Amino acid sequence: SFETRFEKMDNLLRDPKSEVNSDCLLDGLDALVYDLDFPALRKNKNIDNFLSRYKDTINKIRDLRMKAEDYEVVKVIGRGAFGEVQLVRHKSTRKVYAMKLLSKFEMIKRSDSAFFWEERDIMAFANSPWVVQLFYAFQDDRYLYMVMEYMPGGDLVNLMSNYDVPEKWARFYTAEVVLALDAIHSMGFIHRDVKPDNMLLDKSGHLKLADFGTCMKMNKEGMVRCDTAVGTPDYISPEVLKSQGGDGYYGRECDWWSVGVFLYEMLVGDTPFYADSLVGTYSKIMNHKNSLTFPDDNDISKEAKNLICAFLTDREVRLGRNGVEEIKRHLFFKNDQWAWETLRDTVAPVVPDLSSDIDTSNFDDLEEDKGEEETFPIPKAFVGNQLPFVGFTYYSN
Amino acid sequence: ETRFEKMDNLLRDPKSEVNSDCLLDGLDALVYDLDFPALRKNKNIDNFLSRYKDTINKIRDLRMKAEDYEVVKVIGRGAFGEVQLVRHKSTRKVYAMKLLSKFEMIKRSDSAFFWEERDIMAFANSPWVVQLFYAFQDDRYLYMVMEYMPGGDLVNLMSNYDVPEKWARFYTAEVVLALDAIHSMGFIHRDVKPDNMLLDKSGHLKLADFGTCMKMNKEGMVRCDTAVGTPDYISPEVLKSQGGDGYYGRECDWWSVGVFLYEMLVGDTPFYADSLVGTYSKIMNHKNSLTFPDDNDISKEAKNLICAFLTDREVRLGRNGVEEIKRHLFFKNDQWAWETLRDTVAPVVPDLSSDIDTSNFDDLEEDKGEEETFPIPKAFVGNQLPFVGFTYYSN
């Protein structure tokens, strides 16, 4: 078991999960150079000499390390207000990826600069067939970049829009979502907004969760307190809505509420609390005991209705509070084609037809930003706008 | 691939500025220079420090640090710091450790000289040069861990013995070979004196204290306007360089060898005066002020070599190359040859009681005074920036 301090330090340098690995320490240097190199700061001789020593090295370093220029932008497949996601191809290797851009200017300006660490951690390290993998994270003075596996299947909002979804399909996607969420919970995170938008389909048509921006690490009780609120309330549980008003802590069962809403949406065609205003939806959700209604059309399988109602319910009695096994045993999951352990080896309901490795047909097309880069006022003294981003770089090795 | 390959080369190279040691020094320097209450008003700064607090604590502990060594005794003081005989608490190995005050070096300026000192000792790989094993630092000091030279220096030797011409010939010869090794690396030493000449356990000589060294241009010269060295040994060219126009070559080290030889044989320095000023004046006036006692018993050839060293640079012995020094008649002898000189039996082989024996160094008080240093930034100063990259591990 014993290791010398020298061995320990050496492990720290090579460990991908370490904040002191080489790539992380390169960040520090790179950031310091960015933030010190202005004519006013250079009147300090300490700073001026430091930068003279290090600027040859720093320019060559910035040249060797991975950079935005290493990738061609094929098309824009998503937009998030801190930036966007682009289909890219690497120049040397020709491999195709999805690349997320995050704007350092906006994050600083809007003073939301800490939110992406969970998403980095999850996608880099989950090592699960249920989670979009992060291959490379890098940065320049303007953006953070995340190079992810491309998911040409597109998302579940698209699929629900192009198809009428039978119970057999719904059972399949629901089950894959149950397993994805359990993987995330097992990593110690609560997702906090689960919804069709966050569910991507791969080449074989099997689901993975993407977009981990709202995830939070559970404490030892398995609880979190939402930091950021979220956007649309449609898939959000009552206890999460209430906690937004300062009330308290919630646990992972908030994610299972969302699955309930999702199931309902696939089967019924609308979300169960839908309303043409935000406040109308918020109200329906709080009033869920009364507001939850099953449709005119059909009596859909009672097992389905039963599962949905088991999810949409106060947290103390909600399905999943006793763990994921009680969910997997629900009669709604009983079927011929697959078992829980073999689920991902099954042939999927919709397998995408793809003309090229570049085919975006499952994504709504977006033009381009074409807007212009804003810059901070020039430092009169050390400001350190790059400091929050030190340690972001990551290379799967 | 090839991009990824060069990168981890830069990360490994002991001479690379992006190597692991430098990268760690960067972060460590950054944290020291940011962590103050005024600076923590800034949220970027405050959040960065909270985020790295535990890791910085961890790293400071894992890396080589002062508490790893036990201080046996203080064996020298340079006003920019001191040298301590130390024992590594774990390996039990003994070393000489120099401490250089960051405060003093910033205060007095001259914060760049330790770079070449570190490099010469780390990479010389010469029997004539004290080896550096490790260099490290904390917020207060730079540390250099060097081989210990239990023989002590030439000053201690001269205080204990009358030095016969036979010994003087040996030590001057070793000094000549050592200086030449340094010139071949591309440096002028500039502070050559008995105090910087150390004897190993077998009584053979090494140079130490390279803090005054300067790299020669491709012409073999340096351009410098500041008198350096120590008053008894300073050459007229270096003394003159004060207030402008100094351009000079390696032969200033040769001048100092002549002072050394005179002092061994005569028993006084050739330019001695009761004041610095008298000494500087005698040195500028050297053509007139240099005398030997009447009626001395010193040999002509010894006096000839001394006079051939202490004269104006353009005619100085060594001007044309080291060979003309080695051929001088004073060195002619049947005991040793130049190529094997360091394999012979030294004149005085020290008698040592333990690996800890200090008997060849003057007792130096450990403190006996008070402690202090540092000012406090209300904006980022970067007082640690000039030291980033100093840390070194021989490996």
Ligand SMILES: O=C(NCCc1ccccc1)Nc1ccc2[nH]ncc2c1
């Ligand atoms: O498209 C998105 N998000 C859309 C909006 C957005 C949100 C935050 C930041 C920027 C944009 N994500 C994504 C992730 C991995 C992927 N692999 N393949 C497609 C694909 C898409």
Ligand SMILES: O=C(NCCc1ccccc1)Nc1ccc2[nH]ncc2c1
């Ligand atoms: O003791 C000194 N120098 C004294 C003066 C000084 C100058 C600048 C900064 C601090 C002190 N040097 C030294 C070097 C290697 C050594 N190995 N063994 C002894 C031994 C001594």
